[PDB]
Amino acid sequence: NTIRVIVSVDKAKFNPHEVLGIGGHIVYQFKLIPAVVVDVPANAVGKLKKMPGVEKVEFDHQAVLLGKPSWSTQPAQTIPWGIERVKAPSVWSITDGSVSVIQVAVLDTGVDYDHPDLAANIAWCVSTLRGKVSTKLRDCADQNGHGTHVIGTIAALNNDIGVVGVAPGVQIYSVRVLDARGSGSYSDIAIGIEQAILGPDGVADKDGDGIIAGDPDDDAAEVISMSLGGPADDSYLYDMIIQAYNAGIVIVAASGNEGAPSPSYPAAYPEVIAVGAIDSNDNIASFSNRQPEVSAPGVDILSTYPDDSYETLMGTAMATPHVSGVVALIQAAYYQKYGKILPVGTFDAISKNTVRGILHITADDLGPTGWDADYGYGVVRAALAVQAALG
Numbered sequence: 001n002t003i004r005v006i007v008s009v010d011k012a013k014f015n016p017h018e019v020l021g022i023g024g025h026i027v028y029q030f031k032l033i034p035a036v037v038v039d040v041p042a043n044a045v046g047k048l049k050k051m052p053g054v055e056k057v058e059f060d061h062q063a064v065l066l067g068k069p070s071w072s073t074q075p076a077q078t079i080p081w082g083i084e085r086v087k088a089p090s091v092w093s094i095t096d097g098s099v100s101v102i103q104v105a106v107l108d109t110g111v112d113y114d115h116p117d118l119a120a121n122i123a124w125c126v127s128t129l130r131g132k133v134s135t136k137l138r139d140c141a142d143q144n145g146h147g148t149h150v151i152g153t154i155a156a157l158n159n160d161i162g163v164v165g166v167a168p169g170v171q172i173y174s175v176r177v178l179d180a181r182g183s184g185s186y187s188d189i190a191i192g193i194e195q196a197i198l199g200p201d202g203v204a205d206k207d208g209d210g211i212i213a214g215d216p217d218d219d220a221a222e223v224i225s226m227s228l229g230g231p232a233d234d235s236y237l238y239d240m241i242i243q244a245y246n247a248g249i250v251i252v253a254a255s256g257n258e259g260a261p262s263p264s265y266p267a268a269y270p271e272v273i274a275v276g277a278i279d280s281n282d283n284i285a286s287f288s289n290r291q292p293e294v295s296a297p298g299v300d301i302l303s304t305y306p307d308d309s310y311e312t313l314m315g316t317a318m319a320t321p322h323v324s325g326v327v328a329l330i331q332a333a334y335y336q337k338y339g340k341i342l343p344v345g346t347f348d349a350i351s352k353n354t355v356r357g358i359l360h361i362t363a364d365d366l367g368p369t370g371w372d373a374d375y376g377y378g379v380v381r382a383a384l385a386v387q388a389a390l391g
């Protein structure tokens, strides 16, 4: 019948009605890139490619969650091993992430938005599934569990129940881009990245000052966390990754669980921090795809899970939110002190002047000395990173 594609367009020359004319459907017109998600009959893909103003026709590829059940806890608050491993709790007196301009967007299976250990930190929920952007909580709710678990590793509340996140005061945007089985289309994921930049108010840079992340006048997230991965590198997705990066947003993603030689997408992009998984003995997990940028706890990870529950999962998906939490603590501390955020930085940054530079120099260097193919620069450490940021 119909196939989903994403066209990159010249906006002066492209007419969406010409798509409608061939028996297609306009799914989503991106605000931040010159591209449109459309459905067209198979027979019309040729006609699309020749339409005026159509510069590229790309097909809609699939990504999957990167977390699975490993195999449960007392009634009091438990501190999962990985939260102490990334040296987070000592930071909280300085900041636990509750600086008001900071939000972390988690693009995943949705969230148990009323979970007692998460609810006070869930600031906004949206779903982009099938290219239909919804802020109905019933569409945003997690039907899988994975997204709830990831968000609790970042931001579960520090109190007397449940668990606790790396940045337990930080505001979360849950952006639902993966269905009940944890599969997601690249189109929905790119609409999700866009929504994290646009934020609740639907405008990227509302006062027109060119500042998006770290502007208190805007509601852009400062961190986008993607515990998911795909095999394809598509130009429109990368264009959206670059918009986020250029908005000053730190992007973090799981390297993948295939023990493959390099990270999946979007982790593999230069502008994204790829995260590998360690276990509780500081060994790299054998499933962890290699050549990550940093590594973090990703085996036997206890966190929140629907409905008002807790679960132990494993995968590079569980490692990623540890790193996203550390980044939130870095930006929050930096803003608290200076009234601005740090630049994101690059894959090979090695200075205290960028988020990624801090992460790399303060990471616990494991296995062979320096960056290696298993650990990346090593295991992220919040207490040291914040010390570097503020120094």
Ligand SMILES: [Ca+2]
Binding pocket: 101, 102, 103, 212, 213, 214, 215, 218, 219, 220, 221, 222
């Ligand atoms: Ca913000």
Ligand SMILES: [Ca+2]
Binding pocket: 077, 117, 156, 157, 158, 159, 160, 161, 162, 163, 164
């Ligand atoms: Ca708690």
Ligand SMILES: [Ca+2]
Binding pocket: 197, 198, 199, 200, 201, 202, 203, 204, 205, 206, 218, 219, 220
């Ligand atoms: Ca906004």
Ligand SMILES: [Ca+2]
Binding pocket: 204, 205, 206, 207, 208, 209, 210, 211, 212, 215, 217, 218
């Ligand atoms: Ca602004």
Ligand SMILES: [Ca+2]
Binding pocket: 207, 209, 211, 215, 216, 217, 218
């Ligand atoms: Ca401003």
Ligand SMILES: [Ca+2]
Binding pocket: 365, 366, 367, 368, 369, 370, 371, 372, 375, 376, 377, 378
């Ligand atoms: Ca090393």
